[PDB]
Each structure stands twice: as structure tokens, then as C-alpha cells.
Write a protein that binds this DNA or RNA. Structure first.
Length: 119
RNA sequence: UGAGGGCCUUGGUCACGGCCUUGGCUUGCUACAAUUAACGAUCAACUUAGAACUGGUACGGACAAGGGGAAUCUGACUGUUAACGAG
């Protein structure tokens, strides 16, 4: 049976999760607009801030790349360098007109985003 | 003086293009003036309410119903030949 191993708290509701292909860090987006990476010990390693509203989807691109989306109509491409690290936004991807709630990443460096603008 | 963008470039890395690093228009914090911004800019609102041409007025010049005047007698009856009566 699947047994309780370990649970770590957050500030507000958590809306999305990702672990990546090969890694141990857990990526979690919350409803306060902050994306947090964890190192399997309940400790935040990297924080991403800059989204206006709640986060709805977080995806893992590379060891130093992340893509996020939320209630604001913008995807965000973040980069980190490789205490608590503070990632910065490489780019803001605009043009949905309704909140973006899903994202997926392909092998050929492409991203698919599903939003509430029926598009 | 810190941040974010743009043009540069230096090495390692994966078949002109990614990945990791190196040094040089917007906004944030402080220092001296301005506080007559009592100025300027922009978006938005706005069209001409006037109609009618009635009469009576004071004045200037002819009509206006139609024979007049005076006094006595007489009939109800005041304050100067009093008046009045379709006698």
C-alpha cells in the first residue's frame, strides 16, 4: 500500500506540481503567485515571484529553466543560476486574454498552453 | 548610486542555433533648487426663444334721436325771480 512518507506545509493553497524527468526537487505553484522548489526535506531552495495572481500550472524545462502560468494571462519563463535562491524572469509570454491553467513541454523546445479563452 | 531592457564581447559546452559563465530607454532610493501647477495637455459635451400686427387715447374738423324762450295759476314741498311736474 502507498504509505505516508513525508508532508511539508505551504503558505496558501497549492495548485500545481512537477518533479521533472531526472531530479529530486519538487516544483509547486501556489495561489499567492510564488513558485517554490523543494529538496525532499521540506526546505525551499528557489523562489519565483513576479506573477500578479495565483499560479495554475508549473512545468520543468531544464535544470536552470522554468515555465509557469496563472490567473494573469501570461506565461513566464524563468532562469536560475547553477541559502534560498531568487530566480528571475527571462520572458513574459502574452496573448491569452483569459487565465492560463495548463502547460506542457516537448522535446523540440516547444510549449503548449491551455487557457479559459477557449483557445 | 542601485535595478530591469538594448547594442558588444570573452571561454567551456552540445549539430548559422541552443545551454552555463565573464567585464560597458523604463524605474527605485538619496542630495540642491520650484512650490503664483494662480500653468499646460488630452478625452468628452454644445448650438440663434422668439411669436402676433390689436386697438383704445388725448388732439385738430362736420353728424349725432329734435322747433325754441319767459312769466303766472296750480300739485307734492329745500336751504332765491329757490328748485321739481314731459299739469
Amino acid at each position: 500500500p502507498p504509505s505516508y512518507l513525508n508532508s511539508f506545509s505551504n503558505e496558501d493553497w497549492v495548485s500545481s506540481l512537477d518533479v521533472g524527468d531526472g531530479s529530486k526537487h519538487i516544483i509547486s505553484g501556489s495561489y499567492d503567485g510564488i513558485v517554490r522548489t523543494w529538496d525532499l526535506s521540506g526546505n525551499v531552495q528557489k523562489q519565483y515571484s513576479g506573477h500578479s495572481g495565483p499560479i495554475r500550472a508549473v512545468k520543468y524545462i531544464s535544470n536552470t529553466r522554468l515555465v509557469s502560468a496563472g490567473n494573469d494571462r501570461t506565461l513566464r519563463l524563468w532562469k536560475t543560476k547553477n541559502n534560498i535562491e531568487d530566480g528571475k524572469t527571462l520572458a513574459i509570454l502574452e496573448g491569452h486574454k483569459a487565465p492560463v491553467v495548463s502547460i506542457d513541454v516537448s522535446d523540440n523546445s516547444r510549449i503548449l498552453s491551455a487557457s479559459y479563452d477557449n483557445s
